[PDB]
Amino acid sequence: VPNPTMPVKGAGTTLWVYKGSGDPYANPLSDVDWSRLAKVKDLTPGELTAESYDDSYLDDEDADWTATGQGQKSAGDTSFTLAWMPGEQGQQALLAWFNEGDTRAYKIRFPNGTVDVFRGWVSSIGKAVTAKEVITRTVKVTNVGRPSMAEDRSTVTAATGMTVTPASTSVVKGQSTTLTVAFQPEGVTDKSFRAVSADKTKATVSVSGMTITVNGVAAGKVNIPVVSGNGEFAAVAEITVTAS
């Protein structure tokens, strides 16, 4: 199951080239008007840099430390090598792309459900010929303009799905009780929380696995505050610890 929040191993990443006429940045998740370049030996995506702009004036009080700002960004170059199949359609389109010299759109689909789509023109076409090894074809695409990252299409929800079910009962010395924090604004959520007690002398707190464990170290009535996210929601749980 593709999880865009956990690290992924990077095996299964595919590369596609747009061949239709619409907007490549609009719906990249659809591979209808996209031609696949199979047998990818290796791939190194573009690196988005940004040159530095000097923001220093003569009258600026003190000049011990440099002051700079972000200048003009660049989309870098994307370079990949793949098994050389001269008769396979898609590589012929690649040679046509190089010869025409126009800016086309390409995309990389990761084993995460997320696709990074760039636009650029071919600036290199190589080939490595050696015995005992499949002949490979190497390509470099100089990207132009602003690309569409996979973090652009990532969406978040803040529909206030805060709920808390505490034990609200008695806990005896030597054991721990369980408290649940529901984070389901119709299921989808993107925020974290921290739950701690109020004294750390009568009952101790341990929050893990989305749940809370309250240990009755000492008798008395204790309060466990839970704060969700940046302090938009909270909860107070009352727990009693008996003498026994």
Site stretch for its own copies (CB under 8 A), options 22-30, 118-126, 166-174, 178-186: 118-126
> Which residues 6+ apart lie within 8 Å of 228 measured at CB?
162, 181, 183, 191, 192, 193, 234, 235
22 touching its own copies, by CB under 8 A:
no
CA distance 239 to 225: 11
Q: Does 225 bind its own copies (CB under 8 A)?
A: yes
Among 22, 23, 29, 47, binds its own copies (CB under 8 A): 47
Query: Using the rule CB under 8 A, is 212 a contact of its own copies?
Result: no
Closer Cβ to its own copies, 12 or 174, answer by number: 12
Q: Is 42 in the site for its own copies (CB under 8 A)?
A: yes
77 to 106: interface string for its own copies, x by CB under 8 A: ------xxxxxxx-xx--xx-x-xxxx---
Does 221 participate in binding its own copies (rule CB under 8 A)?
Answer: no
Neighbours of 233 (CB within 10 A): 17
- CB nearer to its own copies: give 81 or 177: 81
Chain positions 141 to 200 lying near its own copies, rule: CB under 8 A, are 142, 144-146, 149-152, 154, 156, 190-191, 194-198, 200
> Where does residue 196 rank: exposed (0-12), middle (13-18), buried (19+ CB within 10 A)?
middle
Q: Which residue has the tokens 């609200």?
A: 168
Q: How far is the CB of 33 from its own copies (least distance, A)?
A: 7
Nearest to 239 by CA among 164, 174, 162, 166: 166
If we measure between CA atoms, which residue out of 154, 145, 143 comes closest to residue 112?
154
Question: Between residues 29 and 144, which has the closer beta carbon with respect to its own copies?
Answer: 144
60 binds its own copies (CB under 8 A): no
In the chain, how long is the greatest CA-to-CA distance? Answer: 85
Pairing state between β 77-83 and 233-241: unpaired
